[PDB]
């Protein structure tokens, strides 16, 4: 139902999904007036990110993004509970405007954004259960800029022509997910927010890394042209483009940084 364009687009999500009009919404613009250094923001540790190349992981077009399912043995160490991986996915723009990150920095969009979604597996037996509970989810966000070809991201992008339509699934060999993260992961922004898609649950601890990664113009164009929101047999196809939400009012929140300058 919900979309990023037209009558069912983001200003209407709250009609069906009340949390979309509630507090603590994401994404946000990261800018100086709302940043505050917090020396207690110690480095995360990425455990079991190096997935075996002999195993395979399900890539699915869900009608809104492309998502890779991740195993629960993959987890973040360093939060106040263990958060185990559940899936990663992307947000992007379109061929004529490759500026589709969700978070912005000092008012500017990056080309795209990767989210790696984790859930509190100490407390909950699955991400769905966790998704509507306080600090149930932790998402890592990587800002993506147009730059050099990125062989690691291509381990995902080379399979897109196989998940072109809603409901389609493909298998991706395992690779080291840490290769999708930027330099100096110890430098990040941290804030309490929400899912950026319906149902917009305000249950996410966000970590946005300070530094972007690069993928090429050709890899952005492939991501921006490969996928459809609709099923393979739909007589009204809709391209999966511009699948990012506008930034949200801050509502008195600060964003805490692990870097001072």
The contact pattern for Zn ion, residues 86-115, with x = CB under 5 A and - = no contact, is: -----------------------------x
Is 89 within any annotated ligand binding site? yes
Please write down the HEC assignment for all residues of 79-130.
CCCCEEEEEEEEEECECCECCCCCCEECCEECCEEEEEEEEECCCCCCHHHH
The contact pattern for its own copies, residues 119-138, with x = CB under 8 A and - = no contact, is: --------------------
Active site annotation includes 64: yes
Residue whose token pair is 């099923």: 231
Q: How many residues bind ligand 84I (CB under 6 A)?
A: 17
DSSP 173-191: E--BGGGGS-S-TT-EEEE
Taking the least distance from each CB to ligand 84I, the nearer of 28 and 137 is: 137
Q: Report how far apart the first and last C-alpha atoms of the chain are (Å, whole number).
A: 43
Supply the minimum distance, in Å, between the C-beta of residue 110 and ligand 84I: 15
139 interacts with ligand 84I by CB under 6 A: yes
Integer CA distances (angstroms), 222 to 31, 63, 161, 171, 182, in order: 31, 17, 9, 18, 21
Q: How many residues bind Zn ion (CB under 5 A)?
A: 1
113 interacts with its own copies by CB under 8 A: no
Reference 43, options 186, 141, 178; nearest CA is: 186
For residues 67 and 53, what is the distance between their CA atoms, to the nearest angstrom?
18
CB 239 within 8 A of CB 160: no
64 interacts with Zn ion by CB under 5 A: no
20 interacts with its own copies by CB under 8 A: yes
Query: Stretches 124-132, 154-162, 167-175, 214-222: which one binds ligand 84I (CB under 6 A)?
Result: 124-132
Residue whose token pair is 């009340």: 18
> Which residues between 169 and 228 bind ligand 84I (CB under 6 A)?
195-197
Q: What share of the chain is helix, strand, coil (3-state, %, to 5)?
A: 15, 30, 50
Q: Give Cα 28 distance to the centre of its chain.
A: 13
The contact pattern for its own copies, residues 64-103, with x = CB under 8 A and - = no contact, is: ------------------------------x-xxxx----
What values do phi and psi take at 226, rounded to 5? -80, -35
Is 197 within any annotated ligand binding site? yes
Supply the minimum distance, in Å, between the C-beta of residue 195 and ligand 84I: 3
Taking the least distance from each CB to its own copies, the nearer of 233 and 252 is: 252
Which residues contact its own copies (rule: CB under 8 A)? 4-7, 9-15, 20-23, 25, 29, 33-34, 94, 96-99, 104, 106-109, 242, 246-252
Annotated catalytic residues are 64
Which residues contact Zn ion (rule: CB under 5 A)? 115
Which positions make up the binding site for Zn(2+)? Answer: 89, 91, 115
């Amino acid at each position: 139902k919900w979309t990023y364009f037209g009558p069912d687009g983001e200003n209407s999500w709250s009609k069906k999904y009340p949390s979309c009009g509630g507090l603590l919404q994401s994404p946000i613009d990261l800018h100086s007036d709302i940043l505050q250094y917090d020396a207690s923001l110690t480095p995360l540790e990425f455990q079991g990110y190096n997935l075996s190349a002999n195993k395979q992981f399900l890539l699915t077009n869900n009608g809104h993004s492309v998502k890779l399912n991740l195993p629960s043995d993959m987890h973040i160490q360093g939060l106040q509970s263990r958060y185990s991986a559940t899936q990663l996915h992307l947000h992007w723009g379109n061929p004529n405007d490759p500026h589709g990150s969700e978070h912005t920095v000092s008012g500017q969009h990056f080309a795209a954004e990767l989210h790696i979604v984790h859930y509190n597996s100490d407390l909950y037996p699955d991400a769905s259960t966790a998704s509507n509970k306080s600090e149930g989810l932790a998402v890592l966000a990587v800002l993506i800029e147009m730059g050099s070809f990125n062989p690691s991201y291509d381990k995902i992008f080379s399979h897109l022509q196989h998940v072109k339509y809603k409901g389609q699934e493909a298998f991706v060999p395992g690779f080291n997910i840490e290769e999708l993260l930027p330099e100096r992961t110890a430098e990040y922004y941290r804030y309490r927010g929400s899912l950026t898609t319906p149902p917009c649950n305000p249950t996410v601890l966000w970590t946005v890394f300070r530094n972007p990664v690069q993928i090429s113009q050709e890899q952005l164009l492939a991501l921006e042209t490969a996928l459809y929101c609709t099923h393979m047999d739909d007589p009204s196809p809709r391209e999966m483009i511009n699948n990012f939400r506008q930034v949200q009012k801050f509502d008195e929140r600060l964003v805490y940084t692990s870097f001072s300058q």
